[PDB]
Design a protein around this ligand. Structure first.
Ligand SMILES: Nc1ncnc2c1ncn2[C@@H]1O[C@H](COP(=O)(O)OP(=O)(O)OP(=O)(O)O)[C@@H](O)[C@H]1O
Ligand SMILES: Nc1ncnc2c1ncn2[C@@H]1O[C@H](COP(=O)(O)OP(=O)(O)OP(=O)(O)O)[C@@H](O)[C@H]1O
Ligand SMILES: [Mg+2]
Ligand SMILES: [Mg+2]
Lengths: 378, 378
């Protein structure tokens, strides 16, 4: 057990290319979104572990005494420890407990902690915020129970864990996603742990070696959608017009592959003509997705406003609403981008200017933390 | 030679599906557009043949005496008969003369005629108005010199020529398109002659046996474009992203083929669910074309306004401007369609509510002719 206060942060994700094509065997590219989730863990004296989730406005307190006397599927039983009430986010408090016991069990006394979680990620918008949360939790606990090295052992500003350690973090982050999702693939938590870019084919994942600096505008239309529905309609259209749909899917597959090739050649020396290829790829993937049938008026609107300012975008994820991405290459005029944001907001959409291909699980010194975050954390 | 006044009309064309895909070996569907070109031929006494083209504001008069004394490549020589001045539409007056001599030569005296041509077709917008013109000319002359039966020999209201006769009309209509275009494929003139729908693969054409009643909105954005440019950019992108583009083209090919199948099954009994397939096909072909790169802001705008009213459209032809088509299925409310037209016009576009799969070369009695047409003709 450590004593110092731990501060860890993990990024969310966006599907650059591949969205619906992956369901049919095609390649997809998932990348770390720099909209992070922070978790501050404070050691305590009182025999109580308190998990505090501001966002979802819920706080829960357990007393080590009771949990320490609990006999250590498994889920049903776990629910009999805290309770069983309302909350789609109630599974999270269940995912915390699981991660808490299973990881600290090898301790001769369950520690008394205080966890503070606050992210910049909009929940449910498909940016994998629950994995970012699981990763943060598994990372803080693992470090507190010294099951993993302490990145800031040398009192650095910002730090990360070594490969062997990141693997332990992911494995545990995954169990936590299993409890809340049931059958998660592992892309979300893998993206949150290793950061950077991920390649997903048919159950197999890899980590693109090197990525360039990519600036984007993340837009949330707040339009609610049914992921189960979209995927069904696509499969439906795949059955109705097979000779039309089959090729289309292959076309999207080629877009992921092409992007993979370019990003790699950009990691060398980013020539301006490389951003031109990327936006052409986005333009085409957006049209293909509209063809698949997962488009939405709020999304055509997002692209229309954006193109009006010379920017290129594409939906990201399930389509039919949700978020969209817009590329910001090196050289645009502060004015073009600034107006797009205003326009986007006027439509009633949330808009963030962030980055893609983000760092990954990180430990921060309380002085590396910005002000807005520090205010929400302490 | 006949004596009565002849009145013939021919339809233009629109590419339902296939546009850029045909250049690469894929199937395309061309259909007769019910925006007709009329030609009134009046026999005269004075030894003069007068061709009058109101639209292009030009009239030309020749005297049979001079032409009758002309020794009967060949083009250069033909130009030495009238003259050689300005006019992209000057080749037309040249196409008339060629059709006049070559067809009346077997007469012992060049007749004295008066031709009046007036169409509802916008020139150069890709609706094949020059073929509609060549067809009308070849049809009037052929009938006057009795090289073909007289449809209204039985004093009917409206009539057409028999297969064997329509073939002669097309063959001559083609020479006239050769003079004005140089290397025309024959789709335009074949569509204008036989009407209905045509299937074009790789030099081979066929006539879809039966088509259903299709109502559409023809929209001209009046945005000028370069057909030579568009096709070049497409070939360019085909070279740059081959694994992405190849499949896409195959996807469009499947759209033509699918449409061909449905139209045929609609000719039986047009079930409402058949119009649903057609608009899904248009939606998809429009997205593919945007992917090819032949889209334009004026066209996204055309589709956006239209969808706002529940209607489905797609560009038609070269893209990057020009015309677009919108389907009007049986059952829409006069209000939805009427507002679309207003909106379209506000954008500064010309809009026509016509039909597709039109009749073809026809002879009309001066009482079958509407008022607007009759006013412009006499
Ligand atoms: N800051 C946060 N604090 C606590 N729980 C969170 C936070 N952000 C997300 N979650 C939890 O994760 C769940 C999100 O499930 P959801 O199906 O929407 O997946 P997602 O992670 O939002 O993204 P995606 O489905 O693409 O992965 C919620 O049930 C919620 O309890
Ligand atoms: N009503 C008309 N009267 C006389 N000439 C016409 C008329 N309509 C079209 N034309 C002639 O046909 C030519 C049109 O050439 P163009 O390359 O624009 O082909 P198009 O027939 O308009 O359509 P598309 O190119 O798709 O076939 C002009 O040079 C013009 O002289
Ligand atoms: Mg998740
Ligand atoms: Mg023509």
């Amino acid at each position: 057990m450590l004593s110092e206060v731990l501060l860890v942060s993990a990024p969310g994700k966006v599907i650059l290319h591949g969205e619906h094509a992956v369901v049919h065997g095609k390649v997809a590219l998932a990348v770390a979104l720099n909209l992070r989730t922070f978790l501050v863990l404070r050691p305590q004296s009182n025999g109580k572990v308190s998990l505090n989730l501001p966002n979802v406005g819920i706080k829960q307190v357990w007393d080590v005494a009771t949990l320490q006397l609990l006999d250590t599927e498994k889920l049903k039983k776990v629910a009999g420890l805290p309770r069983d009430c309302v909350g789609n986010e109630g599974l999270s408090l269940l995912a915390f407990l699981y991660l808490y016991l299973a990881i600290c069990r090898k301790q001769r006394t369950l520690p008394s902690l205080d966890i503070m979680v606050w992210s910049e990620l909009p929940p449910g918008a498909g940016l994998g915020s629950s994995a970012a949360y699981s990763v943060c939790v598994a990372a803080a606990l693992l470090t507190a129970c010294e099951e993993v090295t302490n990145p800031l052992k040398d009192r650095g500003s910002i730090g990360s864990w070594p490969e062997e350690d990141l693997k332990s973090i992911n494995k545990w982050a995954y169990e936590g996603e299993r409890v809340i999702h049931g059958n998660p693939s592992g892309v979300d938590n893998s993206v949150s742990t290793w950061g950077g870019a991920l390649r997903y084919q048919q159950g197999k994942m890899s980590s693109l070696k090197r990525l360039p600096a990519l600036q984007i505008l993340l837009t949330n239309t707040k339009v609610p959608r049914s992921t189960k529905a979209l995927v069904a309609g696509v499969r439906s259209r795949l059955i109705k017009f097979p000779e039309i749909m089959a090729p289309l899917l292959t076309s999207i597959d080629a877009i992921s592959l092409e992007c993979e090739r370019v990003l790699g050649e950009m990691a060398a020396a980013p020539v301006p003509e490389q951003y031109l290829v990327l936006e052409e790829l986005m333009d085409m993937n957006q049209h293909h997705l509209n063809a698949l049938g997962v488009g939405h008026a709020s999304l055509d609107q997002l692209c229309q406003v954006t193109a009006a300012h010379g920017l290129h975008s594409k939906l990201t994820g399930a389509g039919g609403g949700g978020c969209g991405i817009t590329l910001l290459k090196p050289g645009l005029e502060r004015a073009k981008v600034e107006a797009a944001k205003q326009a986007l907001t006027g439509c009633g959409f949330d808009c963030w200017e962030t980055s893609i291909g983000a760092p990954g699980v990180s430990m921060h010194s309380a002085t590396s933390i910005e002000d807005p975050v520090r205010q929400a954390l302490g």
